[PDB]
Structure 1
């Protein structure tokens, strides 16, 4: 016989423990034991429990099987979250370590030692079980679709229909649910307080964030009205993704030197500043055709509980102090007397302010639906699903992606009801709410390309990556630093397990992984551009590029466009998401009163703040970038790669803080200690 010393580490998360009867069957080269009881004592969350069991000497241990009887009559939560099992056999000179970090329901098969690619040499029984795991994954994790024009999502009616491995932790479920309750209370209390207020000032909106715990007054609250800070936010606000270098005015945006001459201040005319790379532009043309709440359909000319959006163009200028200044706005796409060019030098100041608000409403709806919901959450969710469908838990790239894919399946399943469903949050707080929001995301998705998720390439393509021409762009600076740190780390992980490109080509799981997304995830359906998802991987560098794009997006990109929302939307006039009247068809009409009647109502503004409160709440159990304390790595070289990655992030963090000390408005959304590994809220 053999004596087996068995140590089981139960995860610390809530309900990780169990009182089910647990047995373990040990398999090795010489045969296998029966199921042996692990009976003495409890399995509480966070516990490390030891057992001594005796049975057939299996020789070199090759795998183990945990079995749970699923509890008895009085068992409240039999499911068991196991970090790892450690076994020592009295006949083997070796310590066997079996990482898990998954929920144990009834049966769990675990392998000892380092991650492997499917063709790496292992006992036949290990390969069989690996294949069986993947077959089961295909049954549990299934594609579903909002429509032909949306990226694939996980099939699940509600959150609690999800496999437990991809549900929120109970801590995050509580963080979320309590945040919704608090929101309701703060809205109710605020509603009582402001119930009979005469709203006749921009500064009335300040009251709406006062009784909220937001981590501080929105940092734009005292400066939203200043052109410099309005411009600033196209670099450092919630939507830093659409500004591009302007190398020629669009034909439908006939800005002349005469329009903007009073704004230039380096001694040169508009044409020269364009050539010098100091002129930038945003074009919201994708919003043409958008259907907003109550019926309005946006046209190239503008328009012919009723809400409105716009598809503006706006021109910006990097002045001699390095400030990005708004110098011209055209509210909709087709130029003319009824859709003129507005500038800071409007004779009627209220007309310039109103133009900025129209630009704001377009940005808000673009940001929330395209930049945030579609291009982080819904599109990366396809990759998270494919990870579970196609990569075995023993696969090194499963281990890599596990901390980064956490959350997105859970929050998106919750969101398909609560956020974009009928009567949902969007219906209440965005101009495009009421149904047009889904059509808009569909429209945006048809243009989505995986190459968009490559930060250096995208910044280059936009012409915004030259700090000498475009200074004070901290999303860029911090994002590029983080990108390089993630890319370097991922490259080192790949080199440990993939020794050459042939190793990549032969890995049927990673091949199945990217193919599943290519064919069933980001489907190139009628009317779609190519989505840039490869059908296969041919090299280590190509694998690195996709994984970096993905991990950066799950963590950093989502953080930059989500946790920035309190500063951005907290003071509503800084970024309205609803407007209540159509755009003007001539100059001279705007007054403070007509503007206030056009801006969101008290209740619409309050709801936007409530939503922002919920979407930006960090959970008490959040794990931030590079915190891999709950990962399943065993390989010493992999642990070393992780050490180097974490030390690099620490250096990046110090540099960002030092940078921030000299800024009027610190840029903090890309501090590693504030970036969740995943997209979970």
Structure 2
């Protein structure tokens, strides 16, 4: 006449509670009494089980109610799951993975994923509708800054619902992690020297040689070469800007007689464009952006350079022309590799600095962080936990809302940590998000479509694009995985369309997240399994693979300041033959900003000791068999990719491992 109720406490630091825990089973034939549990503490990592006897036949168990009542001071409890062993020998499981504060009573369905059309009885429908009601009351949309994608309604981290907070209050913390990173890097004494320029490169080299890793040391030695400059646009930390030219821009008055020395095929520059040997990186987005004026004693400067690139006979991409500003003229020279050494070097440094600003604000912040947060909030608002898509996506939006809220509390807010080192600080980066937001499309988030639209899709013409190669693989694995999860729970396209909560989810992304602008190209609705599989792939790939590629290479390529400076303390050169090495040094970031730069890119490039990489789903929201085997196959494909990439890296001078599935986190956690 008894049930065996098993309760599992989380492994997180504060997962334990000393408060009262009541439990009541809700069955079809009736509900059970409230049973007090333990009368003691539920320690972290611990699993408790009780023999509970019921006074009347409950029939098939539908819901489990858990109730936390206070004892002493409040103590947050993290319930992982609950399993029942019924008198009829049935084993039922209830996935939770939620923080339980004394304010509310938590009610859980069984693990089996359910669409709304599957629930016909009052008890299940009541729960489902009330769950969404509480969701939409806790998770609300907000416009943090004009023209931004909508984000969560919270000023700071602690205001967030306990469920979507970090497991610790200061577990991740920009203020704390940065100063801690600057101590690990032995540069803590330099944190306040914004008026002190490095004496020469050797002065910074003395500091850098201690904290350099493999790639960065390679960067220290080879940053001045043309081959490395062009290399980063394909395999660097921000390889999303380069595109193949179909014609020379009229704002770039470059001639064959200027670049004839770099041309190696006896063709004119115009004819080289016809062969598709010419590539281009345009920073028009940076034009008009306000420079950092938050420091009255330091003048910081920006540029909007146009860089002309060329694929030589060795199939390597190298710079042949660099114009630092958008509108051509006598004071906006076109710098060439045939100019004096420091002229062509300083021109390069500026393009590198420009690449860095677009990287952090557009590629990094907007196109991965903010986009994922949108998918995350829309998921919480419109998708109940029993829904299959919730179970699939929840592992990929982990800590996303939390890390963004932290960043808006400390990093990119007015007078935030971002303002110290960056030339886009002081509001400039806000202008960039706004302007880029206008051209952020749904197709641009679809990886194969994104690569083609830049004209980089050909493996044959452009064989050394590793970001593309590995990316296309990881994308194909996730597309295959989601197509299978969708095929399990959706009989056909008609079921996908008739799903009210899925459409509500898709609609919340279009209308609120993307501000309901028609030019974004996001689906207003999803009416087929094929489309749903692509949509889910966009969500997962962005939060995992795409974010990994553009985040964890920050210390590799940017720890050597002259290769990716956060700010320039002198305006772009308007004339040739003038620039000296002493002036490049005084233009480059000071000691204070170099150190807040070094600390930042180091801290953002770290993996957690408990980091969950792609395919790792420790928390079991899905408990059904067909989806387990789906998840299984997905892990096999990923492990097949890690091998493919591993072999390829053996034949490279500088391996590309950012998109290797064992280094790709599940979500945006940093």
Q: What interval of TM-score do these two structures reach, taking the shorter chain for normalisation?
A: over 0.9
1:547 to 532, 536, 545: 536
1:394, distance to aligned residue in structure 2 (A): 0.5
How far the C-alpha of 1:294 sits from its partner, in A, is: 2.6
User: Which has the higher mean CA deviation after the structures are superposed, 269-278 or 468-477?
Assistant: 269-278
Tell me, in whole angstroms, the C-alpha distance in 2 between the residues paired with 1:136 and 1:484. Answer: 36
| d(CA) in 1 for partners of 2:193, 2:292 | 25
Equivalent of residue 497 in structure 1, options 477, 482, 489: 489
User: Which moves more between the two structures, 120-129 or 665-674?
Assistant: 120-129
Change (3 A) 1:198 1:451: closer
Map of 1:168 onto structure 2: 166
Residues 425, 174 of structure 1: alpha-carbon distance in 2 compared, 3 angstrom cutoff:
closer
SS class of match (2:384) = coil
Whether 2:381 is the aligned partner of 1:389: answer yes
**Structure 1-normalised TM-score?**
0.93
Unaligned runs of 5+ in 2: none
Alignment check: 8 A CA contact 2:19 2:41 kept: no
Q: Secondary structure at the match of 1:102?
A: strand
Deviation of 1:421 after TM superposition, in Å, equals 1.4
- Give the drift of 1:271: 2.9
Report if aligned partners of 2:194, 2:593 keep a CA contact under 8 Å in 1. Answer: no
SS of the counterpart of 1:644? helix
The equivalent of 1:398 in structure 2 is 390
Question: What are the Cα deviations for residues 199-230 of structure 1, in whole angstroms up to 9, with x where unaligned?
Answer: 34334333444454868745422211111001
Q: CA RMSD for the aligned pairs?
A: 2.2
Distance, in Å, in 1 between the alignment partners of 2:357 and 2:469 is 26
Match of 2:431 in 1: 439
- Tell me the SS of whatever aligns to 2:116: coil
Contact 2:194 2:592 in 1 (8 A): no
Gaps of 5+ in 1: 297-304
User: 2:635: which partner in 1?
Assistant: 646
Q: How many residues align?
A: 664
Query: Does residue 117 of structure 1 match 2:110?
Result: no
Counterparts of 1:547 and 1:464, CA distance in 2: 24
Residue of 98, 106, 109 corresponding to 2:94:
98
Q: Which moved more, 1:194-203 or 1:575-584?
A: 194-203
Sort the Cα spacing of 1:54 and 1:177 in 2 relative to 1 into closer, same or farther, 3 A.
farther
Distance 1:387 1:240 in 2: 30
Alignment of 1:153 onto 2:151: yes
Q: Secondary structure at the match of 1:316?
A: strand
Give deviations 1:312-338, integer Å, cap 9, x for gaps: 111111111121111111111111222
Native 8 Å contact 1:62 1:123 kept in 2 = no
Match of residue 85 from structure 2: 88
Distance (Å, rounded) in 1 between the aligned partners of 2:528 and 2:194 = 63
Do 2:179 and 2:599's aligned partners in 1 also have CA atoms closer than 8 Å?
no
Q: Residue in 1 aligned with 2:312? A: 319
Q: Is the 8 A contact 1:278 1:470 kept in 2?
A: no
Query: Map of 1:52-91 to 2, 5 A cutoff?
Result: 52-55=51-54, 56-69=56-69, 71-73=70-72, 75=73, 77=75, 79-90=76-87
Q: Partner residue of 1:663?
A: 652
Q: How does 1:258-277 map to 2 (within 5 A)?
A: 258-277=257-276
Partner of 1:301: none
Native 8 Å contact 1:154 1:409 kept in 2: yes
CA distance 1:605–1:667, shift in 2 (3 Å): same
Conserved 8 A contact 1:386-1:517? yes
Alpha-carbon shift at residue 442 of structure 1 (Å):
1.0
Q: Is the 8 A contact 2:174 2:410 kept in 1?
A: no
Q: Aligned equivalents of 1:327 and 1:204: distance in 2?
A: 31
Residues 53 and 184 (structure 1 numbering): CA distance in 2 closer, same or farther, change over 3 Å? same
Task: Note if contact 1:478-1:656 (Cα within 8 Å) is conserved in structure 2.
Answer: yes
Equivalents in 2 of 1:99, 1:531: separation in Å? Answer: 36
SS in 1 for 2:391: helix
Identify the match of residue 323 of structure 2 among 318, 327, 330: 330
Distance 1:668 1:176 in 2: 26
Which portions of structure 1, spanning 4 or more consecutive aligned residues, are displaced by more than 6 angstroms?
A: 192-198, 213-216
Map residues 173-572 of structure 1 onto 2, 5 A cutoff.
173=171, 179-185=177-183, 186=185, 189-191=188-190, 199-210=198-209, 212=211, 217-294=216-293, 305-346=298-339, 348-524=340-516, 530-572=519-561
The answer to which of 180-189 and 434-443 deviates more is 180-189
User: In 2 relative to 1, CA 329–552 (structure 1 residues): closer, same or farther, beyond 3 Å?
Assistant: same
Alignment correspondent of 1:133: 131
| Residue-by-residue CA offset, 1:421-465 (whole Å, 9 max, x unaligned) | 122122111111112221221111122112111110010010011
Output the CA distance in 2 between the equivalents of 1:47 and 1:177: 33
Shift of 1:100: 1.3
Say yes or no: does 1:628 pair with 2:617. yes
Q: Deviation string for 1:587-632 (max 9, x for gaps)? A: 1111101111111112221211111122222222221111111231
Structure-2 separation of matches of 1:660 and 1:603: 36
* Distance in 1 of aligned mates of 2:194 and 2:488: 63
